[model samples]
Target: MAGHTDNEITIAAPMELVWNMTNDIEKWPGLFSEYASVEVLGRDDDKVTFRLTMHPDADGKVWSWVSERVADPVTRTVRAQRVETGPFQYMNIVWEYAETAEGTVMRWTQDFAMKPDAPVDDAWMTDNINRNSRTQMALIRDRIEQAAGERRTASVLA
Candidate 1:
């Protein structure tokens, strides 16, 4: 069976800031802690092809994969899929942003299914994704808000 997960967080920042910073693929290593390096493979006006190399695992094994993504700033949404499709039969993700009264609400939703003969099952990956999404959302909100704070003085309410 396929699996799905949805996670969202509100960051006290501008919608444009959240959208641009999150969509800036090359800076993801600093924005998202899970990535060790993000190498740009190719790009067009709205789509980008890149490789996401994660940190070494517990056994010191490194995992990396190519992914292609396109983000629409006008619609404030993104669609992405794994180019390598390693363990999963397919992995698809959507990220959307909304300017809330409180701040910007960033939502991440994933639909995926593990390969039938993979080491893990769909249920296992589902659980892992839930945990990872929760932590990553918090981490991103914190960093984005921090950057917005610094910009306040520089922008001077311009």
Candidate 2:
């Protein structure tokens, strides 16, 4: 059982701007399609607990998972681990933000091993899941750039 997912994007926005946008969870559903909805269960210091419903894709079912993410702004890292256990054995998800000449480059990589007997049909489910996740990442990049563009336009005109 081996599984991994990763995405890296370069945006024409400053690191601080990208960081601020990433911290706003309330806007996630609209910004990222994979997140149908997310509700904050609790928050303290760098730790944030939330329940998230993964958007239904071609596979046709939405899965809700609870998660706890701790942020280390000093290191510009976000460590999100799944709090749900039963089917999925272990999950290690990390989001890294770095500055580049073009602007900000963000990388999201996740590794997880599902239960040995999981019902997911590998041929159909796995492919759709992977493709859906990748599309969402591209969507996120577009959304962030569009938002930053609008902000710049407004600031210059005002």
Candidate 3:
């Protein structure tokens, strides 16, 4: 069976800033605390292929996977899919950004199906994804907002 997860956050930064920050694959580790590193494997125009490695947990197990993303700056959206599904039969993600009065709202939607012989089921994956998504979203918001604040401070001093 397939599962879906959607997460969103309103960041106190402009849409263009958020777009640039998120699209910079090499800086993902700094933006998202959950990631230990994000290595860009290849890039062709708007398409980016990379490997994302997560930090080690209490058990010292670090999970990593390869993904490809096609960024559409004109539409302020990105489409990504895992190259190696790992425990999943398939996995895909879509990210959308919108300008808002508060700032910019970034939303992510993920769909995945686990392999029949997978260690965990769809429900388990759904719960884990929601939990991790919340953490990563907050990290993204905090990092961008902090940078925006620094920029404002620097401009004020100048």
Candidate 4:
């Protein structure tokens, strides 16, 4: 009962800048529109553990989960898994950054399976992941591009 999704965005920013900004786990709330807050529980070199609280739903119910991630700056990739999978039996994600002529290409791939007795089916989860990943990727692209542009402007003024 595994479900998978892959999504990517091209940002008009340098690869290093995109990698650094996005890999900074503490800034996820600003980068991800769906997150109400992100709390860093622990960090050791490339390993990061955090909790993410999503914005309340229409019914005013908030969802939260803990995840642990390991980042490889050399390879420009990150691997993460949810410690609290909620309705999922298991959840894992991989993020990659690559330099492209247009800009930096950022990609996210997710593999997850819903609980056998879960209310939602795998198709529903897949659809949701695909849709939400696109939205979040766009937000990351805009945020990184804007920040990079601002830096360029500041340097020109200086």
Candidate 5:
């Protein structure tokens, strides 16, 4: 079976603030702990093609790839697919955001399949992505929440 995972977190921040910061590819290295750097290859309106390099892996190898994403503020979602599929046959992800009474809820849905020659099977990779998604999203939530607090303080102190 192909791999699939869904993860989410609630950030105590404004929807527009979360949307803008999360989609800023240039600042991903600061947002996500695993990424080492991000380089923009090209852009077309709301679609962007970029390269993402991850920190050294367990084998001391730095993994990098080209990917593209398109954001639709109207739908409050961003859809991304891999331009360079290294191990898996294909990888697609969706980021969804919604405003709630508590705050903003962000969700991630990922679906992928491993090739026969790939190192690990789909199930193993599924677990790997599932766990990492939680780790990264939690970090994002914490950062955004802190930013929101600062924004509130700046106005109050004015």
Candidate 6:
């Protein structure tokens, strides 16, 4: 596995709204550039089966997979395990959310291993993944903040 990690962005909104957006698996791809599409295969209150198409990298290969989202409100976490990883040998991601006065604090950790025959350097690939993940998180932060503000404004008018 490459490793585990985190990055948190403070948003100007409420925690409840941020929490709702975080668990809305359907909107994930639209907010992250790396995610080209997302398909929900099955879903329950705490678990979701889905597929995701990630951004194309230097090799022009698209990262994609069949995965699941497990929500644990008690622990404030959501885990995604990729059944068929696109280019890598294995990929499983876990995201943890904590409350902040502004909104929510979000962090993601990915546990994965590389394929034996992969051409790139392990360090380089790991760096690429880290950078991409950070960018994706920033996108989420911006989108949710905007959405929450819009909803708040609309509610006020009603």
Each model's lDDT: 0.88, 0.79, 0.90, 0.89, 0.90, 0.75
Candidate 3, residue 126: CA error in Å?
1.2
Return the TM-score for each candidate structure.
Answer: 0.91, 0.88, 0.93, 0.91, 0.94, 0.81
Per-residue C-alpha lDDT of model 6 across residues 44-126, encoded as one tens digit per residue = 87788988777687789876678887888778788788766555677778878777665678777777766777666557767
Show model 2 residue runs off by greater than 4 Å: 121-129
Q: What are the per-residue Cα lDDT tens digits for candidate 4 across 1-111?
A: 349998889999998899889987788886789889999999888788999888885558787899999989899999999988878999999999898899999999999
Clash number for candidate 1: 0
Please identify model 6 stretches exceeding 4 Å from their true place: 85-89
Residues 1-158, model 5: lDDT tens digits: 45989898999999999998899889998998988899999999889999988888666878788999999999999999999788989999999999999889999999999889998899988887887789999999999999999999999999
Name the candidate that leads on TM-score.
5
Question: How many Å off is the CA of 116 in candidate 6?
Answer: 2.6
True-structure RMSD, every candidate: 2.0, 2.1, 1.6, 1.8, 1.3, 2.6
Report clash pairs, candidate 1: none
Worst 10 residues of 2 by lDDT: 120-129
| Clash numbers, per candidate | 0, 0, 0, 0, 0, 1
Q: Which ten residues in a row have the lowest lDDT in candidate 5?
A: 54-63
Candidate 5: count of backbone clashes, pairs at least 3 residues apart or interchain: 0
| Residue clash pairs of candidate 6 | 34-55
lDDT of 2 by residue, 1-158 (tens): 24677778887887877888877887888888777899999988779999989877566977888899997879989999988754666777899999989888888877776677876533444455467767876787788889899999999999
Candidates ranked, most accurate by lDDT first: 5, 3, 4, 1, 2, 6
